[PDB]
């Protein structure tokens, strides 16, 4: 039974399901990646980081790691006792197969599935999870492993040899498509540019914290601010004498109240296309 083979694999922050067959645990190779790495990952170098002790299997100690295309094959010290007789096969779209959805290493349910012509599975059950496997039962013919979640409940996966179905890669951005989140540090840089240009009407008497600001930012679909963003704006804060957190408080008021008919640098909208590099270089000559 696939339920007994399902295990939880953790590497650093990332955690997903794995398939435990004999002393090998199969899982998506992107478990070694964080959100920053998933952008466009150097899997060879990121795997050079990871050693056998970095991977954690919960059903266990890994005695070896071998990457085959997009699947990571982890040799473990304890062989799996209830391993079914299995084979690895590759299906085509429109052929039915059963997928056992697991979240945090514990199974949820068994769903009948069929890949669409674009090689994706449309289904909400796989969302929030990663690593669930598909199979046909007669021998257990494993045919599928869930790798990627796409915005509208659309899921991409590989076979058990690690080859993706369709033209998909295990790469993704931190922000989903259609989010359209405003780039906070760019808005702040543009506000500093407005002050250096003489626009002061929006500066208020208040300061704020990262936590308080980020509550507002999430409410209005702005990128939450980090200390790294704060440091980036360092030159502009020093030029104007206005602390970043003070400017954040001005922006918070602008988000909650709007511009109330006024403009900033000639615009009735808060602008986020100017990067701090653009602004710092242009403000330096002033």
């Amino acid at each position, epitope marked *: 039974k696939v339920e007994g083979c399902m295990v939880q694999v953790t590497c650093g922050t990332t955690t997903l399901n794995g398939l435990w067959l004999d002393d090998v645990v199969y899982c998506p190779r992107h478990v070694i990646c964080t959100s920053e790495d998933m952008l466009n990952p150097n899997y060879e170098d990121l795997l050079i980081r990871k050693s056998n002790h970095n991977f954690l299997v919960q059903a266990l100690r890994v005695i070896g790691h071998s990457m085959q295309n997009c699947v990571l094959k982890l040799k473990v010290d304890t062989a799996n006792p209830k391993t079914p007789k299995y084979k690895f096969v590759r299906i085509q779209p429109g052929q039915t197969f059963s997928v056992l959805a697991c979240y945090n290493g514990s199974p949820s349910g068994v769903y009948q599935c069929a890949m669409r012509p674009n090689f994706t599975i449309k289904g909400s059950f796989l969302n929030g999870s990663c690593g669930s496997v598909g199979f046909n039962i007669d021998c257990v013919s494993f045919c599928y492993m869930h790798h990627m979640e796409l915005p509208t409940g659309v899921h991409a996966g590989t076979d058990l040899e690690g080859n993706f179905y369709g033209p998909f890669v295990d790469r993704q951005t931190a922000q989903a498509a259609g989010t359209d989140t405003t780039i906070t540090v760019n808005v702040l840089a543009w506000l500093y540019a407005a002050v250096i240009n003489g626009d002061r009407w929006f500066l208020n008497r208040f300061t704020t914290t990262l936590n308080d600001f980020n509550l507002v930012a999430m409410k209005y679909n702005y990128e939450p601010l980090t200390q790294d963003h704060v440091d980036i704006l360092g030159p502009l804060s020093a030029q104007t004498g206005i602390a970043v957190l003070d400017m954040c408080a001005s922006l918070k008021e602008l988000l909650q109240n709007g511009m109330n008919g006024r403009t900033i640098l*000639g615009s009735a909208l808060l602008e986020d296309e100017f990067t701090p590099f653009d602004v710092v270089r242009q403000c330096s000559g002033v």
Partner: nanobody, 127 residues
């Protein structure tokens, strides 16, 4: 460094005008070029900018798309095509140039970020 604008005049609401500015005496390096406008009593405001490096353009919300800023380093001209003009577009229009600046992408629309200025041509949109 010298700058001279051209192409202003009077037009009816919904009409079109094309401004041109002769950038002269410049080092032919990467620069910020901007089109500014100023109504009587109102402050001068940049409305369209272009970076002669990568050619990225910025427009304020009120004139975006309707106005298109252009550059012609071969003829050393910066242009502003103004379509579907509105009476509130009535103002004196100035072209402006920064000093040489490399490595950036987008030029800010503030007057503080420009060094050389034209004489200003008047645009009058009547209703």
């Amino acid at each position: 460094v010298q700058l001279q604008e051209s192409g202003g005049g009077s037009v009816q609401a919904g009409g079109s005008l094309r401004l041109s500015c002769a950038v002269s005496g410049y080092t032919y390096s990467s620069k910020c070029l901007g089109w500014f406008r100023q109504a009587p009593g109102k402050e001068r405001e940049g409305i369209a900018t272009i970076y002669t490096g990568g050619g990225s353009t910025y427009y304020v919300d009120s004139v975006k798309g309707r106005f298109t800023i252009s550059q012609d380093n071969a003829k050393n001209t910066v242009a502003l095509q103004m379509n579907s003009l509105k009476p509130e577009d009535t103002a004196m229009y100035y072209c402006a140039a920064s000093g040489a600046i490399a490595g950036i992408r987008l030029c800010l629309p503030g007057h503080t970020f420009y060094t050389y200025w034209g004489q200003g041509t008047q645009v009058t949109v009547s209703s």
